[PDB]
């Protein structure tokens, strides 16, 4: 049997980056040729491994994480990066062994009146550890006084909404991302 990569890339709905989705891939023959031979991908950078030489490598588990961010924020999905996404939504380790794949999805994830279904975490006291998934909705206490779960001054909703409209610049249109994590065996080529 073959690995369910077609489920991830050709998925109908993608998750918001703060609540990024994780698929655990195991016990399957992985055909990586379907990916690096595709001309529909705008970003495809691999770390600690070669793209063409992956059908010759065995790993214990493969992790595919998928979410939606801004095109401006694709540069942050990489080891040693900082930013509103890398710090507070999805963080890669410095010793990352895997590949980051992205492509524009303005035709799907932008509505005429503005798509607000895709969100990103804007407020957090400290940075995320590698592969940390923070889905908290607690009101952010930016001031001296406590919030008690009520919004107001110095008490803000920690998430912010992307305004995905078709008229947006390249950097502001939605991009769908899939992060493959190779862990070292049940997934080979």
């Amino acid at each position, epitope marked *: 049997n073959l690995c369910p990569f077609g489920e991830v890339f050709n998925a109908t709905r993608f998750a918001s980056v703060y609540a990024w989705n994780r698929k655990r891939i195991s016990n399957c023959v992985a055909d990586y040729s379907v990916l690096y031979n595709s001309a529909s991908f705008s970003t495809f950078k691999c770390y600690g491994v070669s793209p063409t030489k992956l059908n010759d490598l065995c790993f214990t588990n493969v992790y595919a994480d998928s979410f939606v961010i801004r095109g*401006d924020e694709v540069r942050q999905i990489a080891p040693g990066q*900082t*930013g*509103k996404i890398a*710090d*507070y939504n999805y963080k890669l380790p410095d010793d990352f062994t895997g590949c980051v794949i992205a492509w524009n999805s303005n035709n799907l994830d932008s509505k005429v009146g503005g798509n607000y279904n895709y969100l990103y975490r*804007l*407020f*957090r*006291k*400290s*940075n995320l550890k590698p592969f940390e998934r923070d889905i908290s909705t607690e009101i*952010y*206490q*930016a*001031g*001296s006084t406590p919030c008690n779960g009520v919004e107001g*001054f*110095n008490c*803000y909703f920690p998430l912010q909404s992307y*305004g995905f409209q078709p*008229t*947006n*610049g*390249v*950097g*502001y249109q939605p991009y769908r991302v899939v992060v493959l994590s190779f862990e070292l065996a049940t997934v080979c080529g």
Partner: antibody
Amino acid sequence: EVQLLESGGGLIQPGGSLRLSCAASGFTVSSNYMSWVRQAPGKGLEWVSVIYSGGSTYYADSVKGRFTISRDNSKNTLYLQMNSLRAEDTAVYYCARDHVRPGMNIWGQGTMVTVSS
Amino acid sequence: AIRMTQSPSSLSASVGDRVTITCQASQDISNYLNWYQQKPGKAPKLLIYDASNLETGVPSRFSGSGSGTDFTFTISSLQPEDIATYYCQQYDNLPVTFGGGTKVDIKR
């Protein structure tokens, strides 16, 4: 009420150093986005540095490697360490709680840094 | 790095005249553009945030519109205390960049 008070500006020889303190009241510095913005005499505004809520620091190209930004949670104070100062660093230095949402944008009153001999 | 261009550099208008200044962005900055009023000697004061939204406490005579790359800042009826230098800034994309400024004088 809520206000930003800053100090530390004055005369300093070129190549010297100078730290600017920005004391806050009404909010937590370690929890907000803070920014330094300088205005040369007669000129426009120039963004300098930013510290995020999580701690990530960013600097302008003209001061990168020379200026440093930090904060003290116990004192609720924003700092700006300036090293290898040049004559073109002479300006008023405003510290500001960066605008992120409706009504949180607040600016200091600036201190005059005069780099001369 | 983005470069904001602000026209006009200087301006003089009568009390009550409609005053409009523009700020064109070098790249797309969506609507992440703010407007500041800097009276002489004092610090800049945020008037319009996110291109068109009025900060709490600003008089209604201050207006803003625009998205993408071209924006406008409108004073409905100019008042004597409105004399200042007005700047535009983008902040979503780093580094943060300002406009050249617009000095406004009253024609009395």
